Design a protein around this ligand. Structure first.
Ligand code: CMP
Ligand code: CMP
Lengths: 201, 198
DNA sequence: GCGAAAAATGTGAT
DNA sequence: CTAGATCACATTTTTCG
DNA sequence: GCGAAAAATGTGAT
DNA sequence: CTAGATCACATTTTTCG
């Protein structure tokens, strides 16, 4: 579409697993674009604990936040969850594709619109729903987005308790017991893969 | 220029000191613009308590997140914080607007970006910081927004314990003593009008 | 600028 | 009053060559 | 079908 | 091991007409 026009002005790079693509801080001047692969977008505290503040996937743009204002620091980290093919353009160039065909600035904005929405829920269920709650709708969203083996009938994602814990913002230790005694209610399953939607005990 | 152009095309309405300007649950119709005043995006707890996610003042944008797909159920209530003068246009009558001019595709999108930046922060401060902490940062932010009135020392900011508890996410009892602690440590005063000696 | 009616809020032990 | 954190060390899963 | 390093777990009383 | 929360009606500070 239009997106193959913008995509052609873009050096196509592969990254390894666990590479960093962006650090919080770094000069913001390149607007990326995931061609293949998935990506976790974090933030971290000077003391150390981090948070997962979204996943992103094919056709998701990255580094979008700089572009509207000049010279600002990258707002979060992003580390390839797995091997990605990411493209890239300078902002100085991007804004040109824009004033040469304005549909891509549509493509882009709708991205951060769903994003402003999903994020405002995330604030909402940190001030409201306790761990068990926060944990619950999480495994839920973790099947409306790819890796959910319909164990035959019913999801089976893999994500480690430590990870869930890093989505929710609760100790790895709490994410153990709650997830555990969550199968007590016959609602869940275990090992590393969580087979959601049914469960057992 | 656009902010006076599109401003021509729109339709100015006054809303009093408290009208519930937009409502969650609902349907993405008009795209609004604060011609005068400020606003209080607040979402709602399971049943009951609000949490302010933002304020948006003179010249910010409301209900844009409707714009780029369709049938989108409105995202959070937006209640005026005072007599703010909303100048409404139209989604349908925005797209047309948007191709005789990309400049305001831009500005709306710039606001969109600024907001996901500070929203990302909230998600960070709620999980990376203790309550007194969120209370300290907040008074810092509010003293750094327009209604704040410069004072001989610091910035004062007419607000109330119930509302910091809100914005923060903690019992108004707990906003109660923290404010009296930092009171004693000279970092802040109160009387409804808390002066942030900072 | 006014005061009645309305909204803010603080005690602590668990 | 009550949920969630924190602690060490061995225990398990899980990795991949 | 491999098999020990590695990364992930669970105690449990406070 | 501890961080906030909490539930009443007296006094205070704030509203709007
Ligand atoms: N709230 C968010 N949700 C998801 N992704 C985000 C969020 N905030 C930032 N990002 C992404 O992570 C990137 C980190 O640096 P940037 O500010 O360029 O761009 C950011 C976005 O692309
Ligand atoms: N996180 C946020 N920060 C600021 N404003 C927001 C946020 N979430 C929603 N809004 C505003 O509140 C409105 C809710 O419904 P809309 O989707 O019409 O458009 C929304 C935004 O303009």
């Amino acid at each position: 579409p239009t997106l193959e026009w913008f995509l052609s002005h873009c050096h196509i790079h592969k990254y390894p697993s666990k590479s960093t693509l962006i650090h919080q801080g770094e000069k913001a001047e390149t607007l990326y674009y995931i061609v293949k692969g998935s990506v976790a977008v974090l933030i971290k505290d000077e003391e150390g604990k981090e948070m997962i503040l979204s996943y992103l996937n094919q056709g998701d743009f990255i580094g979008e936040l700089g572009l509207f204002e000049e010279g600002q620091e990258r707002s979060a980290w992003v580390r390839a969850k797995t091997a990605c093919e990411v493209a890239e353009i300078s902002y100085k160039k991007f804004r040109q594709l824009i004033q040469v065909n304005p549909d891509i600035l549509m493509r882009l904005s709708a991205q951060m619109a769903r994003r402003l929405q999903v994020t405002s829920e995330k604030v909402g269920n940190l001030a409201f729903l306790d761990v068990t709650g926060r944990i619950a709708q999480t495994l839920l969203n973790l099947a409306k987005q790819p890796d959910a083996m319909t164990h035959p009938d019913g999801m089976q994602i893999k994500i480690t308790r430590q990870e869930i814990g890093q989505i929710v913002g609760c100790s790895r230790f709490t994410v153990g017991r709650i997830l555990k005694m969550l199968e007590d209610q016959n609602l869940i399953s275990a090992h590393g893969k969580t087979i959601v939607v049914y469960g057992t005990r």
